Amino acid sequence: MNPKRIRALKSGKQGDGPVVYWMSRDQRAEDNWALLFSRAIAKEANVPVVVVFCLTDEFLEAGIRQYEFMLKGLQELEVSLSRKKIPSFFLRGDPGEKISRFVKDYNAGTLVTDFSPLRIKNQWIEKVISGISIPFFEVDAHNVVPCWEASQKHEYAAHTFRPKLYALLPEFLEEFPELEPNSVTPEVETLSDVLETGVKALLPERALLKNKDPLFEPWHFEPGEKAAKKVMESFIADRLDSYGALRNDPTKNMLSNLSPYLHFGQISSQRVVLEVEKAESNPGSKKAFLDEILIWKEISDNFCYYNPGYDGFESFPSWAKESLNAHRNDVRSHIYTLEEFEAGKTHDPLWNASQMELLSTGKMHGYTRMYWAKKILEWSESPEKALEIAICLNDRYELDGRDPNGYAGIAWSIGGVHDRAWGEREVTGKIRYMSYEGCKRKFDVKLYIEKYS
């Protein structure tokens, strides 16, 4: 129980009622530092711990693919917390109003939530803080090393954040203590009812094709805390050995496929790191996978935390803002609208195959994601339009969308964030360029195109 994982958002008078855990980003019962610290505070106060989840009005800004994945996991989570005598309350509406009412109605003594550097999460905290008088804590249950402890500033490169994160690994990379159940069961609708209503409201915006059939294939990633563990065990036993040599081959499914579970917090990355470190395989493949789940994943939280405008052109490096500004008036070879990018109606078959995989599976390959967003910059009227188009298609169709990884991954491709300057080209400027011929020399582009017609 390292006290550096928990930060105080607002001090106040601790009430004589239960400790309330505000689950937002880490929807899981095991390996949850936020839930564990809530159980410790509750035990020292001689009071049980409760879990609350808010079903916000922003769910309609996404699709059914993300609403069903996250609600089906909550149905499994409600069972697991029930086995620990931990009641879970699911509220619908504004967190600033539903939590401020839950705290006063249930006589909350302490409020705890998990950490998320997103702007929407900071909006809820501001509304909640002004409506409560009890202590307010937050816990970094998503990163191995707390985001405010790994670095005190924004790291402009990976080679500057890697020594800082690895130097703190011997302290924060530890095993998880068991979640002690509540002593006695203590003293707002069914999740299946909220799922049917939410789907009926989202159906008119469902992604379809010509024959009115749905585009999403939900049999690729089963949601839940139990399904995340099976995926982790399959990757370590079957795909971890070849990850280093095939992570850039979209025609091979050699990736861990853990991101949708990682985004919703259905599995803890620290648990994944612990299992991989004890696994004996290719050292080059292990070093490559850890550089993705530790360095690049937690540097995305670092990027969103220390850059308020992480989704804007202002967060780009000075060399990239000046390079893009010098090529703003360059005549673009193509200009596609958001509807053409969404439907995959560009002249690039490789790009359309990446967009069709996104629409069909909700998880586009990591390598094509770099090509997918860089061509949005090349075929847009301005870098700002490319950012908004890339963010829209990402957050809407990616199962791991609306994530700090997504915003840091798009800032890297369009604005060179966490990258360096390359040869100066037109339109794109000094941003790293990925050509269609370059992808042909890296993998079989024909097999990837034919797989997603």
Ligand SMILES: Cc1cc2nc3c(=O)[nH]c(=O)nc-3n(C[C@H](O)[C@H](O)[C@H](O)COP(=O)(O)OP(=O)(O)OC[C@H]3O[C@@H](n4cnc5c(N)ncnc54)[C@H](O)[C@@H]3O)c2cc1C
């Ligand atoms: C344009 C673009 C958009 C992106 N949008 C998303 C997004 O919406 N959501 C999202 O979680 N990630 C996004 N990524 C990061 C990355 O593409 C995915 O995390 C990765 O492809 C997820 O599939 P995986 O779990 O099988 O990858 P793996 O190769 O098995 O890696 C495991 C984990 O390492 C992390 N990771 C790997 N690569 C990156 C990376 N480049 N940046 C940050 N973390 C990484 C991820 O958490 C990932 O789950 C984006 C990257 C780009 C270039």
